[PDB]
């Protein structure tokens, strides 16, 4: 009713083409096909066997329209270190979420320390069920609120530090 969507990964026509740093070997676009053969465009990284990971993935520029306070809803799934065969002392079961406020919608190389940290996201009590035909994905669902924003728009970023993450859906919205 009063929700205005500022970004929905599930609705974007074609590739997301967010920005992965690193560009190869970190976050990669993986397409899970729903019953109609419509891509569901996920972002995944699972280098749990390999130390000192620092993999970033950021969105396109997102306009805030009028709003100071935005809401971020992520549906994801994490492989617990417990369930992954291998000796892996640097395995992790969270990722970090960041934002960068910019008037410039073609920011190219925004640096790590310009990003401002929202939270560490973990698989927790809340989940959802997304029926895609052949399967039902059971996924974690977390929402965070960021603000107060005061620039034409912003960038979201997800940092991986040694986890096995699938980000299946990212919606960003505000309440009008």
């Amino acid at each position: 009713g009063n929700e205005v969507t500022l970004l929905d990964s599930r609705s974007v026509q074609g590739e997301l083409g967010w920005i992965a740093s690193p560009l190869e070997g970190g976050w990669e676009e993986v397409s899970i096909m729903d019953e109609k053969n419509t891509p569901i465009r996920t972002y995944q990284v699972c280098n749990v066997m390999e130390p000192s990971q620092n993999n970033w993935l950021r969105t396109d520029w997102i306009t805030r329209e009028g709003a100071q306070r935005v809401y971020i809803e992520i549906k994801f799934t994490l492989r617990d270190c417990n369930s992954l065969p291998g000796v892996m002392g640097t395995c992790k079961e969270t990722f970090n979420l960041y934002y960068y406020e910019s008037d410039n919608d073609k920011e190219r190389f925004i640096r790590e320390n310009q990003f401002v940290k929202i939270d560490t996201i973990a698989a927790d009590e809340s989940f959802t069920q997304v029926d895609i035909g052949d399967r039902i994905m059971k996924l974690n669902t977390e929402i965070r609120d960021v603000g107060p924003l005061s620039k034409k728009g912003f960038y979201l970023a997800f940092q991986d530090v040694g986890a096995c993450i699938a980000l299946v859906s990212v919606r960003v919205f505000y309440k009008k």
């Binding site: 990669e28 993986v30 699972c46 066997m49 799934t77 399967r135 299946v168």
Partner: peptide, 12 residues
């Protein structure tokens, strides 16, 4: 490569 890939279920 990724050790595991989420496709429906995780595949490692």
């Amino acid at each position: 490569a990724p050790y595991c890939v989420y496709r429906x279920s995780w595949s490692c």
